[PDB]
RNA sequence: GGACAUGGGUUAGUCGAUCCUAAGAGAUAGGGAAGCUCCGUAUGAAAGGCACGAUUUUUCGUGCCUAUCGAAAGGGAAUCCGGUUAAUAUUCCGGAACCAGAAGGUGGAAUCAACACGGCAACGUAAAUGAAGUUGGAGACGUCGGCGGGAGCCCUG
RNA sequence: GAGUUCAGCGAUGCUGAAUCCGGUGCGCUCUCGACGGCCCUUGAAAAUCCAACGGAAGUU
RNA sequence: CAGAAGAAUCAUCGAAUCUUUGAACGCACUGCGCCUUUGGGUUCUACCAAAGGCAUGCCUGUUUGAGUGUCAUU
């Protein structure tokens, strides 16, 4: 055999360049980055880059070779290609001025189905139900944003539907466990085939798009969410029995009715049970009657929340009326008046808290993290010297790579946030006496 | 755990659920999780499953072994300028001192006393092996003296003279001078033979004599090497069989004087050789750097270091081992003191024990330098440790 | 296992660098676009559509002092669709008063007599219809600025509305909506505070994106119901 | 530098046709008819499209429901098409306006229409480019386009525009079209040829 | 008998070929020729690459640089000793090495003073990142004579 | 511990020893270093390997 | 001859198999490559094997282009 060669097998050969595979692959770098969406393709790290990249030291992106190899035999490729070519026969009927044409074009626009992508990204229905977390975060980001040139209207009307889809699984399974207000939203936590599901879902306030973010990015990634998520609820309510999609009620749809529109026929989860909740028109309703009725709770709501109320404000078997104002002119009785926050602490304790202390006009007791597991020492709302010296001062070198050094990294934070909230609890209690 | 009305720290703290605002970030930070997802490499760790860092170290079981050098009780205070160095007679009553002041300080350890103000830039100066022969012999400058002092009684300044009485040798508050030697170069470093008819002297600016052998008994002076190359830094002897080792600036070389030759060279792995010292048992050397390393050779392992120890923040000045204790210590310009465990054992499969025991501090600085010399007391326990502000403290 | 997602291969330096050169890119070719010729046939096509629209202003004005004013609701949602050069100076005023004085502004209206004349007046360069409460709740959540300090500022959170009109038992969002939806006390308070929508067509559709002239289809005049349809596709 | 052989054999072409004089049959086809005459005869030329062949097949199924189930017309009006059939419409009198490609690659194949429609007494023009003709027609080119009968709404449209072409075409140009073509030299290059012109006449010829 | 018949016999990462080029040949581009075919080898050939990028109106932009055959004697990574067969040995057996490539790991070394120190110097050392782009060296170079060194052989106590 | 040569003793084994110290020469064979001429004809190419200038990039 | 027992060195013949070559086709004429997929191992970023591909001219269509080639675009 000849003399082998530097540079033709191992980390050289394993490993390709974003340039490399880009040219690999004949495609564009949106292209390129759009199959890495869909597929799941991301860059990897060699140990020695340097001889990874054939003895360059040039910074430098690195994915596997068999991932690429992967892509050639990918089927959406051609997609995106067929559409380039549609795209192309459209702006030749356009500058024609063969309208008609245009629209037989149009109507037949290539398109292409994530079947087989998400069958191979996935496994398992298990495995999908893991990585399900960001599909839903993402879906109800968009489900509140206005529509754009970017994302498409249908795109939007996608997410509310698979949204809410998800959510009337949730009520009738009852496998919601923790609700968390926090600045950020309101963090939701589902159990489903023993699964744990955690995802947030923004308040509905007039936001700007910030500007500075590629919606292109995320157009990519809400397509394949929707694709994803239109599958597993598919199969969550065959699971149950019932019927998919559920049908629209599109009179109480577009009265606002929320929930009330999709109709789920059929083909401490009781903390609620016996419990006629009433929403005034000053809190979020998108959240309180999901955490309410997932644990079976009757909800009635202000008509201007939306239509379809069961209850009215007049009708008397309202045993809890949540209004956050801090005025209630129609004071009624035997309705006792609360605050959203007595309902989220009720499903992360589970356990009905106390109402007075959630009347109107309260302190607000503070709300705590039901995801916050409690640390070694950090403290929850809710002679010597001679010898360890010389403990701490040998090995501090008679080692080879001093890994001990991760000390000063874990027991400092660790330390200095339990003394820091250690020391809180001596000064709030000095402010009080 | 951050919200509305949260105690774990003090975001922000909204009075009530309607004045929560929209947080404005929520879509950068989720596009910023899309980004991670297909831009983010991914690398597979084991996850260093809970594992505390203290389950690594070793266990030194240090009051178990306990000749430690506690803090400081004697402070000798006196001299003017920083104690270039310093040592004790053989005896350990007598310390001789020296520094730049060129003020030579003979005390006594028991009390601290002064009893030779005699000065006489002190480079070195090391006493005599011969108990009955206490000759001590200082280095300044190019010249070296063979000193008596009459606090000796009188037939031992005699027993020093008769052992004598390249470089040119000739024959005051009891100035008892014996016989001064001029070298070429300034002397930096001495040592003793361990009979005293040999003393050893290594100076680095020289290169063809860096180092030079005088025999007292000849009263005279050579080069042992035919052609030296590297500079010298410091010189010392076996103290078991007639070896004499060179600590250049980067290697350590064993010289047979009896053959003639070369017999081991110790790559130090260092940029700059400060001092050696050598264990009693002779197959022990423990070389100060200016590395801030302290590296421990093992004549009977390897050619390469056996251990290498990076405490110091500052250059390794010197390091001296116990002529009895297994104890070794090194001074370096940070002003602190590294006192260790250096346990031997004859036995093949046996690695010596090294751990740490002390780090003696409190210490000045000047010029930014610190400790210059340590020396050992022959006795127990005690070190000298000689400082950049004119003081001596006894480590007890 | 163990995975760590490390820092993005992104290079953020050289990134906001291309986005500013973009950008400056973009100032220089806004400064370049100036002074465009005109031929005589734009100036023509001018005069016959003033024309035009000063015979329909004199027929509806005189001898048609009749409005129909769409019954069964107290509210109207109004939007610009249309508007051309050297606009007669009435239509111009009209288009201020129902603070429609730039194209695509939606305004909420109260049905009466007086809005209805005004709107008559302007009826070929406006669509109105009927907003239900899925349109007004999602105009207001999604694309609703009210003027603080006489700023266009987004009502993302309630302390602003609180502020500004608390004096009118005004306190979030769902006070705006609901005096907005029933016509409340303090509508005209309200209304003031609420900047006029900005519902620019979508352009979604490759085929949107080429044809000229695009404006979603959008018709003038009264349109009822489907009005919600429109502001359907827009939020 | 180095072009590839196809640009060079291009460019020569363009300059080649500018330089060598040009005969008048074919040097009247670089004088065209102007932009706003032009587009308001495309203007007219886009109302009498012929129907597409989809548009053709959606109409003749509409009729044979009719005779299947259940069972005078109008005879149809569009633009003329296709060389030989706009000759013979030409030949015919037919034509109210012939619309002739600038560009037509053998030049043979229309070199003779301006004259023929001179003959003919038929309003012609030569307009920019086969690809706009072949547009209106929904082909790839049109060497010639002919109105011959349009609806009596359009019967004015067609009177102003035949009457913009014969003052901005035939009013115009007529002796240009007369003369030789060609000959269109450079500023420098008529200077430079004169040099090469007086050296040549010095003792270069042989 | 080197005949006839019957069987056996050639073992390699390191030895050659394999790889490179030489004078030359030669397909391709083109052009001749009725034609078998001839001329032509960077020739008026669109003569093939590399990097960059939160994705770019989810239709790719920007920048950079621009055949083959022909040498078992030329150039070239790396193996030695002892033993072994009826016949094979730098190949097999025993022992001892070497070269080339490949990944991690262990230990050592350098850095929030950003990529090591020392010596006047020639330069040294266990290490001591170097993209595009630009160079330099080895390969790699006539012949003759004398002198010096070493090895083997020869001479000899 | 191999090989060779001597002695033996008993499948070809086992046991002894020695295998040493020199001197050398215009010697022969091969190679290297340092010169000195003659050149003129100032003395193949490529694969392959190395280095330099350059400064992109960058408690864990 | 031995041996075997729908036999057959049978006939017919419509299913197949059909090594290396040769117009002879990845490039050369003991060899040397490239691309795709799969597999093995007592060792898995390495090595190995297997299977299927890679000649020239021309035609039809497809896709992607180039052109200071001919134009249009208020």
Known sequence: ARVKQKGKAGAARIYITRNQALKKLQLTLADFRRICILKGVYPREPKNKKKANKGSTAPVTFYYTKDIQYLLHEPIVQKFREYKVFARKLSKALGKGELETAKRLEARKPTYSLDHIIKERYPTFHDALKDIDDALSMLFLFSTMPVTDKIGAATVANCERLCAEFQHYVIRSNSLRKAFLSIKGIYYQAEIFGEQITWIVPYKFAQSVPTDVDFRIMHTFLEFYQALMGFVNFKLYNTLGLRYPPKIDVAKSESAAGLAAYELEESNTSLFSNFTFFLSREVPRFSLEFVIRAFGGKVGWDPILGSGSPFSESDPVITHHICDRPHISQKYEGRIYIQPQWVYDSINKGILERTDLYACGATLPPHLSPFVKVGENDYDPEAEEKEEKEAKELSKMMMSNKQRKLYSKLKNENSKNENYNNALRNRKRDIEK | EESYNPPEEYPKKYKSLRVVPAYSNLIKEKFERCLDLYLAPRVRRTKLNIDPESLLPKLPTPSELRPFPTRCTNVFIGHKGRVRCLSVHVSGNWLASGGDDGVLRIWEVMTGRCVWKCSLIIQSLAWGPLSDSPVLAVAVDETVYFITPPIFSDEQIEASKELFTSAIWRRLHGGIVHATVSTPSSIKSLSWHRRGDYLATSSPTSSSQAVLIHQLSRGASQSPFSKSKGSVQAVTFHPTMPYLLVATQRYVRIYNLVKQELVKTLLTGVKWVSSLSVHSSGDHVIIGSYDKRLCWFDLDFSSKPYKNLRYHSRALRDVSYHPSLPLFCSGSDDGDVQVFHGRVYSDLLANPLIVPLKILRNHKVVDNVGVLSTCWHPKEAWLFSAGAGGEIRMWT | ?235 | VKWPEYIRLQRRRKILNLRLKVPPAIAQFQKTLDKNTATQVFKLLNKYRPETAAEKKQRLVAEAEAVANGKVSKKPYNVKYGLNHVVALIEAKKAKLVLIASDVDPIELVVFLPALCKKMGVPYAIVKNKARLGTVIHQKTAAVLAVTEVREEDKNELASIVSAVDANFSAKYDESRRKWGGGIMGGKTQALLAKRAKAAAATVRL
């Open chain 3, 1 to 235: 296992p163990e995975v760590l997602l490390k820092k993005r291969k992104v290079n953020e330096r050289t990134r906001k660098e291309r986005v500013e050169q973009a950008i400056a890119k973009k100032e220089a070719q806004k400064k370049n676009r100036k002074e465009t010729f005109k031929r005589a046939e734009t100036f023509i096509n001018n005069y016959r559509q003033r024309e035009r629209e000063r015979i329909r202003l004199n027929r509806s004005a005189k001898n048609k002092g009749d409005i129909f004013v769409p019954d069964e609701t107290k509210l109207l949602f109004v939007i610009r669709i249309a508007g051309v050069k050297n606009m007669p100076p009435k239509i111009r005023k009209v288009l201020r008063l129902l603070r429609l004085s730039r194209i695509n502004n939606a305004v909420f209206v109260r049905n009466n007599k007086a809005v209805a004349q005004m709107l008559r007046i302007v009826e070929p360069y406006v669509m109105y219809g009927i907003p239900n409460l899925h349109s007004v709740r999602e105009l207001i959540y999604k694309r609703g600025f009210g003027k603080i300090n006489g700023q266009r500022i987004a009502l993302s959170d309630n302390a602003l509305i609180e502020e500004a009109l608390g004096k009118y038992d005004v306190i979030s969002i769902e006070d705006i909506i609901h005096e907005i939806y029933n016509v409340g006390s303090h509508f005209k308070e309200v209304t003031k505070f609420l900047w006029p929508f900005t519902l620019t067509p979508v352009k979604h559709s490759l085929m949107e994106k080429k044809v000229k002239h695009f404006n979603e289809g959008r018709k003038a005049g009264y349109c009822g119901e489907e009005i919600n349809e429109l502001i359907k596709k827009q939020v």
